[PDB]
Amino acid sequence: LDVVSLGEILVDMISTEEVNSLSQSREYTRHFGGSPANIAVNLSRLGKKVALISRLGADAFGNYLLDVLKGEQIITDGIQQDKERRTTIVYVSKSTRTPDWLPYREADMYLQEDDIIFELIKKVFHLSTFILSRKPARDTAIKAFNYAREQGKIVCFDPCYRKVLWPEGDDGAGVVEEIISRADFVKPSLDDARHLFGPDSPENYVKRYLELGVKAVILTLGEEGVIASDGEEIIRIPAFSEDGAGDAFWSGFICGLLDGYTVKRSIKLGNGVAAFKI
Amino acid sequence: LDVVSLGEILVDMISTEEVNSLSQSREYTRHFGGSPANIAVNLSRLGKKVALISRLGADAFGNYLLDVLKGEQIITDGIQQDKERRTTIVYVSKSTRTPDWLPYREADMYLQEDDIIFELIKKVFHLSTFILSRKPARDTAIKAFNYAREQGKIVCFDPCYRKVLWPEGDDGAGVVEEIISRADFVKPSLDDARHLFGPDSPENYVKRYLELGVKAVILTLGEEGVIASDGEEIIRIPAFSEDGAGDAFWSGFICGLLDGYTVKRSIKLGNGVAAFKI
Numbered sequence: 001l002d003v004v005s006l007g008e009i010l011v012d013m014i015s016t017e018e019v020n021s022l023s024q025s026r027e028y029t030r031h032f033g034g035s036p037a038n039i040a041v042n043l044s045r046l047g048k049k050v051a052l053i054s055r056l057g058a059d060a061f062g063n064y065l066l067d068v069l070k071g072e073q074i075i076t077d078g079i080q081q082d083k084e085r086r087t088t089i090v091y092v093s094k095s096t097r098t099p100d101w102l103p104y105r106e107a108d109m110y111l112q113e114d115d116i117i118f119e120l121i122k123k124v125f126h127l128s129t130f131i132l133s134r135k136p137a138r139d140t141a142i143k144a145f146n147y148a149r150e151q152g153k154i155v156c157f158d159p160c161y162r163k164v165l166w167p168e169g170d171d172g173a174g175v176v177e178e179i180i181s182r183a184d185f186v187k188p189s190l191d192d193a194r195h196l197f198g199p200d201s202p203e204n205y206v207k208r209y210l211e212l213g214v215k216a217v218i219l220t221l222g223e224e225g226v227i228a229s230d231g232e233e234i235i236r237i238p239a240f241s242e243d244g245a246g247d248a249f250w251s252g253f254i255c256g257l258l259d260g261y262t263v264k265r266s267i268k269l270g271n272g273v274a275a276f277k278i
Numbered sequence: 279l280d281v282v283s284l285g286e287i288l289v290d291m292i293s294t295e296e297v298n299s300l301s302q303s304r305e306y307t308r309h310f311g312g313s314p315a316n317i318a319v320n321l322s323r324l325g326k327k328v329a330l331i332s333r334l335g336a337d338a339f340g341n342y343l344l345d346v347l348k349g350e351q352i353i354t355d356g357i358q359q360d361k362e363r364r365t366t367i368v369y370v371s372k373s374t375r376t377p378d379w380l381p382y383r384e385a386d387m388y389l390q391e392d393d394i395i396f397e398l399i400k401k402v403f404h405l406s407t408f409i410l411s412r413k414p415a416r417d418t419a420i421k422a423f424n425y426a427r428e429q430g431k432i433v434c435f436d437p438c439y440r441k442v443l444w445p446e447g448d449d450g451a452g453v454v455e456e457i458i459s460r461a462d463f464v465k466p467s468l469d470d471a472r473h474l475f476g477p478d479s480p481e482n483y484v485k486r487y488l489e490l491g492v493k494a495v496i497l498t499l500g501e502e503g504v505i506a507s508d509g510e511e512i513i514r515i516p517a518f519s520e521d522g523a524g525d526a527f528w529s530g531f532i533c534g535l536l537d538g539y540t541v542k543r544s545i546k547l548g549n550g551v552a553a554f555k556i
Contacts, residue, residue, distance in 0.1 A: 023342030060301035
């Protein structure tokens with residue numbers, strides 16, 4: 001009824017060891033992951049009815065993922081269990097200067113076309129770029145994207161475009177663009193921006209409002225707040241730079257559907273409690 | 279020049295946590311794995327010229343594997359770097375009284391046909407069953423198997439047959455058998471035996487000498503020594519049960535090429551250095 005999130009669900013194998021390469025990482029902790037999935041969990045914790053549309057294998061990890069999905073009261077009807085493929089897994093290093101991530105994609109990219117009914121019942125629809133990168137799941141994703149629009153739903157897209165995830169032949173950038181243009185809100189980060197628009201802009205990136213982007217776009221600047229704009233005006237949230245966690249922010253922003261005004265961008269901000277309470 | 283080992287090379291993600299399922303394992307340590315690979319490393323440490331024939335991806339793990347392969351002075355000419363597939367990875371528990379492993383095979387099963395020259399230069403050739411389970415690599419493995427025989431090389435096969443690793447249609451057992459019959463030595467374990475011959479035998483399993491097995495076969499009984507036989511006679515190594523690590527044992531046994539007599543089965547025995555003695 002509230003939000004429908006479509007994209008990848010996977011387990012993250014993280015290694016905090018400070019090494020040169022991931023080939024040097026020896027210790028790994030298994031985490032629940034997948035941005036669309038983290039957003040779902042959060043929205044649920046913020047007490048909203050969410051439905052995550054993903055594909056995971058029928059194995060230890062898939063089961064593990066489902067368990068936390070069920071324990072978080074995330075509606076899991078649109079979740080698909082691949083009877084033959086493995087649950088997607090990404091290996092990560094995590095550090096100020098040194099990630100390196102290795103993707104072992106499988107199930108996540110084999111998402112089928114089943115519950116488009118979930119949309120209508122919802123009313124925010126959120127989509128990620130990751131899910132778009134690979135051939136089979138990509139199609140069911142945009143098909144769902146366009147359906148959500150047809151149904152007059154609020155469409156949120158995260159233009160986290162990164163070429164490596166894409167086949168040598170496909171465009172990639174145009175696909176991400178073909179969608180930014182048809183979306184309501186987007187959350188590019190400076191990196192997500194450099195990757196799609198090159199360095200040609202330090203904040204003018206937001207000129208992507210002309211990138212068809214329509215709606216409005218909030219550009220996160222990591223350790224310096226955000227810059228939103230609906231085209232009529234540009235806003236830098238914390239005016240004081242001294243006064244990352246996009247899935248939390250996005251969740252808060254999405255949740256800003258309880259009230260109104262894209263001031264929800266601030267509400268989301270307070271939601272980025274990297275921090276620790278719980 | 280000494281030994282040519284052909285089979286899988288992969289990284290093992292182990293979790294010692296005592297849990298019911300692997301879906302409960304949260305901590306994983308990254309290890310260098312692959313039986314044919316462990317045998318190579320050992321032979322190398324026992325100071326013999328070995329060449330491991332395997333296929334790993336062109337990524338963190340593949341690189342990691344190579345580094346230890348190079349640091350162990352293992353000849354790596356026949357090693358293939360898959361430019362597109364991921365390095366195979368197996369998840370393991372060791373846990374409870376409820377063990378479990380999850381294979382993420384990729385590169386390892388895509389071994390090609392390149393250095394058959396390695397054999398001639400070698401003179402023991404060792405093969406595993408794992409590598410035979412899946413369709414592409416399986417072919418280059420037996421082709422190498424038959425070549426090694428044609429060249430009059432000593433052929434060592436580990437009949438670690440386990441159905442799950444095999445496609446629903448393929449025979450599996452007959453393939454493993456078709457090879458046991460053409461090999462010189464084999465190292466089945468009681469489990470490897472129960473899996474291929476059912477329980478129909480507690481030690482009579484060794485009747486597999488008639489299983490075409492030819493040469494001789496040493497049957498490891500885990501915590502009770504081994505039972506070898508060339509058909510003319512059956513021997514139980516430690517006569518006293520109170521007086522697992524097959525890759526070490528096998529290495530030792532293989533290394534028993536410095537001297538003679540299959541008494542090398544004893545030399546190998548001393549070679550398993552779990553954490554006891556030494």
